Design an enzyme around this catalytic site. Structure first.
Site, PDB file in Angstrom:
ATOM      1  N   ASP A  37      -1.378  -7.732 -29.679  1.00 33.32           N
ATOM      2  CA  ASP A  37      -1.112  -8.773 -28.662  1.00 33.32           C
ATOM      3  C   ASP A  37      -1.079  -8.271 -27.239  1.00 33.32           C
ATOM      4  O   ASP A  37      -1.310  -9.067 -26.342  1.00 33.32           O
ATOM      5  CB  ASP A  37       0.254  -9.465 -28.841  1.00 33.32           C
ATOM      6  CG  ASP A  37       0.477  -9.996 -30.220  1.00 33.32           C
ATOM      7  OD1 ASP A  37       1.650 -10.252 -30.561  1.00 33.32           O
ATOM      8  OD2 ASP A  37      -0.463 -10.144 -31.055  1.00 33.32           O
ATOM      9  N   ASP A  77      14.021  10.187 -33.970  1.00 29.32           N
ATOM     10  CA  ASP A  77      15.189   9.473 -34.492  1.00 29.32           C
ATOM     11  C   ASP A  77      14.940   7.990 -34.574  1.00 29.32           C
ATOM     12  O   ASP A  77      15.320   7.345 -35.529  1.00 29.32           O
ATOM     13  CB  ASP A  77      16.384   9.660 -33.477  1.00 29.32           C
ATOM     14  CG  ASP A  77      16.743  11.099 -33.345  1.00 29.32           C
ATOM     15  OD1 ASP A  77      17.105  11.698 -34.388  1.00 29.32           O
ATOM     16  OD2 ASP A  77      16.656  11.645 -32.229  1.00 29.32           O
ATOM     17  N   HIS A 104       8.013  -5.738 -45.426  1.00 29.94           N
ATOM     18  CA  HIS A 104       7.387  -4.542 -44.858  1.00 29.94           C
ATOM     19  C   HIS A 104       8.187  -3.285 -45.196  1.00 29.94           C
ATOM     20  O   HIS A 104       8.091  -2.262 -44.446  1.00 29.94           O
ATOM     21  CB  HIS A 104       7.273  -4.694 -43.339  1.00 29.94           C
ATOM     22  CG  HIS A 104       8.602  -4.984 -42.686  1.00 29.94           C
ATOM     23  ND1 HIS A 104       9.132  -6.270 -42.627  1.00 29.94           N
ATOM     24  CD2 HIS A 104       9.495  -4.160 -42.054  1.00 29.94           C
ATOM     25  CE1 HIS A 104      10.344  -6.199 -42.038  1.00 29.94           C
ATOM     26  NE2 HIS A 104      10.559  -4.943 -41.707  1.00 29.94           N
ATOM     27  N   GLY A 128       7.533 -14.947 -40.444  1.00 32.95           N
ATOM     28  CA  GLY A 128       6.426 -15.622 -39.732  1.00 32.95           C
ATOM     29  C   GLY A 128       6.810 -15.918 -38.318  1.00 32.95           C
ATOM     30  O   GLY A 128       7.830 -15.462 -37.874  1.00 32.95           O
ATOM     31  N   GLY A 138      16.746   8.963 -41.449  1.00 34.35           N
ATOM     32  CA  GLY A 138      15.697   8.177 -42.081  1.00 34.35           C
ATOM     33  C   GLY A 138      15.458   6.868 -41.390  1.00 34.35           C
ATOM     34  O   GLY A 138      15.163   6.847 -40.158  1.00 34.35           O
ATOM     35  N   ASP A 162       8.517  -8.241 -35.387  1.00 31.71           N
ATOM     36  CA  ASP A 162       7.695  -9.119 -36.255  1.00 31.71           C
ATOM     37  C   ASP A 162       6.332  -9.401 -35.576  1.00 31.71           C
ATOM     38  O   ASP A 162       6.232 -10.015 -34.539  1.00 31.71           O
ATOM     39  CB  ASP A 162       8.524 -10.396 -36.497  1.00 31.71           C
ATOM     40  CG  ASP A 162       7.839 -11.383 -37.417  1.00 31.71           C
ATOM     41  OD1 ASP A 162       6.727 -11.101 -37.931  1.00 31.71           O
ATOM     42  OD2 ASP A 162       8.560 -12.388 -37.766  1.00 31.71           O
ATOM     43  N   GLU A 215       5.106 -12.786 -34.246  1.00 33.30           N
ATOM     44  CA  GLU A 215       5.350 -13.292 -32.921  1.00 33.30           C
ATOM     45  C   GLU A 215       4.206 -12.920 -31.995  1.00 33.30           C
ATOM     46  O   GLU A 215       3.420 -12.017 -32.339  1.00 33.30           O
ATOM     47  CB  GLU A 215       6.622 -12.646 -32.340  1.00 33.30           C
ATOM     48  CG  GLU A 215       7.842 -12.634 -33.296  1.00 33.30           C
ATOM     49  CD  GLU A 215       8.126 -13.993 -33.894  1.00 33.30           C
ATOM     50  OE1 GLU A 215       7.799 -15.008 -33.230  1.00 33.30           O
ATOM     51  OE2 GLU A 215       8.691 -13.988 -34.965  1.00 33.30           O
ATOM     52  N   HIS A 247      21.174  -2.345 -30.970  1.00 32.66           N
ATOM     53  CA  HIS A 247      21.544  -2.153 -32.377  1.00 32.66           C
ATOM     54  C   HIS A 247      21.228  -0.712 -32.840  1.00 32.66           C
ATOM     55  O   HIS A 247      22.008  -0.106 -33.615  1.00 32.66           O
ATOM     56  CB  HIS A 247      20.724  -3.144 -33.261  1.00 32.66           C
ATOM     57  CG  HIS A 247      21.165  -4.607 -33.137  1.00 32.66           C
ATOM     58  ND1 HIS A 247      22.493  -4.986 -33.189  1.00 32.66           N
ATOM     59  CD2 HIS A 247      20.445  -5.759 -33.024  1.00 32.66           C
ATOM     60  CE1 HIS A 247      22.573  -6.303 -33.131  1.00 32.66           C
ATOM     61  NE2 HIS A 247      21.328  -6.817 -33.031  1.00 32.66           N
ATOM     62  N   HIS A 287      26.692  -7.828 -32.229  1.00 25.33           N
ATOM     63  CA  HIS A 287      26.441  -8.855 -31.319  1.00 25.33           C
ATOM     64  C   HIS A 287      27.592  -9.217 -30.418  1.00 25.33           C
ATOM     65  O   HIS A 287      28.731  -8.990 -30.788  1.00 25.33           O
ATOM     66  CB  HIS A 287      26.060 -10.144 -32.099  1.00 25.33           C
ATOM     67  CG  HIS A 287      24.643 -10.087 -32.594  1.00 25.33           C
ATOM     68  ND1 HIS A 287      24.205 -10.626 -33.782  1.00 25.33           N
ATOM     69  CD2 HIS A 287      23.553  -9.459 -32.032  1.00 25.33           C
ATOM     70  CE1 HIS A 287      22.905 -10.367 -33.929  1.00 25.33           C
ATOM     71  NE2 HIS A 287      22.488  -9.676 -32.883  1.00 25.33           N
TER      72      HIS A 287
HETATM   73  N1  LIG Z   1      17.313 -14.369 -34.883  1.00 25.65           N
HETATM   74  C1  LIG Z   1      17.417 -13.331 -35.851  1.00 25.65           C
HETATM   75  O1  LIG Z   1      17.551 -13.651 -37.003  1.00 25.65           O
HETATM   76  C2  LIG Z   1      17.346 -11.870 -35.431  1.00 25.65           C
HETATM   77  C3  LIG Z   1      18.303 -11.001 -36.186  1.00 25.65           C
HETATM   78  C4  LIG Z   1      18.085  -9.565 -35.789  1.00 25.65           C
HETATM   79  C5  LIG Z   1      18.875  -9.167 -34.568  1.00 25.65           C
HETATM   80  O2  LIG Z   1      19.816  -9.931 -34.392  1.00 25.65           O
HETATM   81  O3  LIG Z   1      18.376  -8.169 -34.032  1.00 25.65           O
HETATM   82  N2  LIG Z   1      17.649 -11.707 -34.027  1.00 25.65           N
HETATM   83  C6  LIG Z   1      16.574 -11.518 -33.116  1.00 25.65           C
HETATM   84  O4  LIG Z   1      15.452 -11.535 -33.546  1.00 25.65           O
HETATM   85  C7  LIG Z   1      16.830 -11.391 -31.637  1.00 25.65           C
HETATM   86  C8  LIG Z   1      18.028 -11.810 -31.084  1.00 25.65           C
HETATM   87  C9  LIG Z   1      18.222 -11.723 -29.709  1.00 25.65           C
HETATM   88  C10 LIG Z   1      17.238 -11.195 -28.897  1.00 25.65           C
HETATM   89  C11 LIG Z   1      17.394 -11.189 -27.527  1.00 25.65           C
HETATM   90  C12 LIG Z   1      18.516 -11.714 -26.863  1.00 25.65           C
HETATM   91  C13 LIG Z   1      18.279 -11.646 -25.247  1.00 25.65           C
HETATM   92  C14 LIG Z   1      19.285 -12.113 -24.219  1.00 25.65           C
HETATM   93  C15 LIG Z   1      19.082 -11.812 -22.920  1.00 25.65           C
HETATM   94  C16 LIG Z   1      20.032 -12.291 -21.994  1.00 25.65           C
HETATM   95  C17 LIG Z   1      21.137 -13.067 -22.470  1.00 25.65           C
HETATM   96  C18 LIG Z   1      21.241 -13.347 -23.851  1.00 25.65           C
HETATM   97  C19 LIG Z   1      20.279 -12.841 -24.651  1.00 25.65           C
HETATM   98  C20 LIG Z   1      17.000 -11.139 -24.979  1.00 25.65           C
HETATM   99  S1  LIG Z   1      16.242 -10.788 -26.415  1.00 25.65           S
HETATM  100  C21 LIG Z   1      16.026 -10.827 -29.443  1.00 25.65           C
HETATM  101  C22 LIG Z   1      15.836 -10.910 -30.811  1.00 25.65           C
HETATM  102 CA   LIG Z   2       9.606 -14.220 -37.057  1.00 29.10          CA
HETATM  103 CA   LIG Z   3      15.240   6.845 -37.852  1.00 28.75          CA
HETATM  104 CA   LIG Z   4       1.431 -10.819 -32.877  1.00 34.19          CA
HETATM  105 ZN   LIG Z   5      12.259  -3.957 -41.068  1.00 34.05          ZN
HETATM  106 ZN   LIG Z   6      20.700  -8.723 -32.803  1.00 40.54          ZN
END
Ligand SMILES: NC(=O)[C@H](CCC(=O)O)NC(=O)c1ccc(-c2cc(-c3ccccc3)cs2)cc1
Ligand SMILES: [Ca+2]
Ligand SMILES: [Ca+2]
Ligand SMILES: [Ca+2]
Ligand SMILES: [Zn+2]
Ligand SMILES: [Zn+2]
Length: 159
Positions: free
Chosen positions: A20, A54, A64, A72, A86, A94, A97, A118, A124
């Protein structure tokens, strides 16, 4: 306390690239997302292309190879494992996206800032202005800043 890296020098490797974006734009987005976290902690991150990194950055779809399949387009955008050997630390995006450098599709830089959180051990936030809030929000990239709650969290783990 959740798991934390026991060292302040952390390497990462980009395992593959999403079609992308231009490869250079993926590298920049990832490098800038690590820099956000290095700016408020003693951590330093270095990119390697071979050897034993790391934090591995992967783009993948569906089931995956870990226990947490993707879904999706939409929904789960990415996920990451907390500090450990590991798969620990690794951040997976994903490919269903549409990853971008901007507000369209899903912004890779912002999503990587969250996932790298994370990978460093954060959970969170319940602050809507914190990048660690559970849902994606596009915010202007040029003026992006971690919230005080993000900075409290990461400085409570590394200092
Ligand atoms: N929605 C989900 O299931 C997944 C779970 C995995 C995870 O929580 O990492 N969550 C996401 O895919 C995800 C959640 C939040 C963000 C982001 C939050 C913000 C952000 C920025 C400013 C203020 C609040 C949030 C930018 S990306 C990106 C992916
Ligand atoms: Ca997805
Ligand atoms: Ca690792
Ligand atoms: Ca893509
Ligand atoms: Zn994974
Ligand atoms: Zn998260």
């Amino acid at each position: 306390m959740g798991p934390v890296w026991r060292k302040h020098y952390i390497t990462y490797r980009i395992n593959n690239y999403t079609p992308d974006m231009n490869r250079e734009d993926v590298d920049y987005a990832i490098r800038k997302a690590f820099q956000v976290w290095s700016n408020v902690t003693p951590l330093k991150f270095s990119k390697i292309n071979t050897g034993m990194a790391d934090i591995l950055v992967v783009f993948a779809r569906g089931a995956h190879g870990d226990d947490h399949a993707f879904d999706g387009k939409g929904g789960i955008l990415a996920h990451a494992f907390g500090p450990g050997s590991g798969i620990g630390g690794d951040a997976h995006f994903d490919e269903d996206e549409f990853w971008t450098t901007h507000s369209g599709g899903t912004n890779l830089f912002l999503t990587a800032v969250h996932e790298i959180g994370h990978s460093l051990g954060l959970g969170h936030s319940s602050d809507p202005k914190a990048v660690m809030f559970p849902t994606y929000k596009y915010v202007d990239i040029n003026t992006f800043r971690l919230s005080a709650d993000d900075i409290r969290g990461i400085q409570s783990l590394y200092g």
